[PDB]
Amino acid sequence: GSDLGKKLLEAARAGRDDEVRILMANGADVNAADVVGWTPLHLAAYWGHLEIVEVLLKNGADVNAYDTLGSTPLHLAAHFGHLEIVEVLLKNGADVNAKDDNGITPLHLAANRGHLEIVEVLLKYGADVNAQDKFGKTAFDISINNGNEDLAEILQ
Amino acid sequence: NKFQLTPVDVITAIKAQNAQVAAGQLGGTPPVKGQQLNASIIAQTRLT
Amino acid sequence: STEEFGKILLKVNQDGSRVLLRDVAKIELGGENYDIIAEFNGQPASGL
Amino acid sequence: LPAGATQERTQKVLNEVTHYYLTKEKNNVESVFAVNGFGFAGRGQNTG
Known part of the structure; x- marks a missing residue:
């Protein structure tokens, strides 16, 4: 319950790159968490603030930090098409096969929204193509259900 | 009682068999090219 | 989207296969009604 | 157009x-x- 921790969370969400840098120098906790378990790196990934993702990882932020439902920055980045952020997270040792409480992986979420570029990068970093969610669904199954043939070809 | 029926069955039967049904048209829109005939389709009408 | 309407799961077969809405229907954005065709010098038109 | 005339014929x-x-x-x-x-007499596929 640190004041500077709450400011960083709000600052990293709105995309204040310079205010982050200042709060980092002032000694604000990089791994401060919401009520729902979101860190600044969660928010930066979700809203697509690349520089802040790079700045937070440079100041020793947990790249594999997980929320109360088991979702990581990579889950959010991969889901909502932030390709540049997916590359940076994976370059800083992000768990490519991270399972949320539903057994959903970055590859599932990327496949769900038909982000071909992100899917191909996740596969390059060794994403388990046969990984099943709690319902036994693979990325390929998701692609077939959505009628995405281009994406189905890649996972076959 | 003799036919194992109640007022519910009577009401249900009346709503079904005393009905005004919208049934579209022959050659209705949007049609196929070359269609020769356009005609209203008449199904069940109210009893008189 | 037409995609989301296409994914509507109508039933699961005994063998375990899926019948989606797009397996029994074509899915497109169209008019509420097709009973009026408007043109302006031969080309398609709407208006107020 | 006469009775039963289609959208295509009227076009x-x-x-x-x-x-x-x-x-x-x-x-x-x-x-x-x-x-x-x-x-002005009425509407349908046989009017324009």
Whole structure:
């Protein structure tokens, strides 16, 4: 319950790159968490603030930090098409096969929204193509259900 | 009682068999090219 | 989207296969009604 | 058009009417707004 921790969370969400840098120098906790378990790196990934993702990882932020439902920055980045952020997270040792409480992986979420570029990068970093969610669904199954043939070809 | 029926069955039967049904048209829109005939389709009408 | 309407799961077969809405229907954005065709010098038109 | 006449048949006649005004009255007419399926006597596929 640190004041500077709450400011960083709000600052990293709105995309204040310079205010982050200042709060980092002032000694604000990089791994401060919401009520729902979101860190600044969660928010930066979700809203697509690349520089802040790079700045937070440079100041020793947990790249594999997980929320109360088991979702990581990579889950959010991969889901909502932030390709540049997916590359940076994976370059800083992000768990490519991270399972949320539903057994959903970055590859599932990327496949769900038909982000071909992100899917191909996740596969390059060794994403388990046969990984099943709690319902036994693979990325390929998701692609077939959505009628995405281009994406189905890649996972076959 | 003799036919194992109640007022519910009577009401249900009346709503079904005393009905005004919208049934579209022959050659209705949007049609196929070359269609020769356009005609209203008449199904069940109210009893008189 | 037409995609989301296409994914509507109508039933699961005994063998375990899926019948989606797009397996029994074509899915497109169209008019509420097709009973009026408007043109302006031969080309398609709407208006107020 | 006569009874049972289709949208397509009515569109051929409106095209003849449109073409005439943009041809034989080219000097007088600016545009023709053709409406298939509405008349003052009534509406349907056989009116324009």
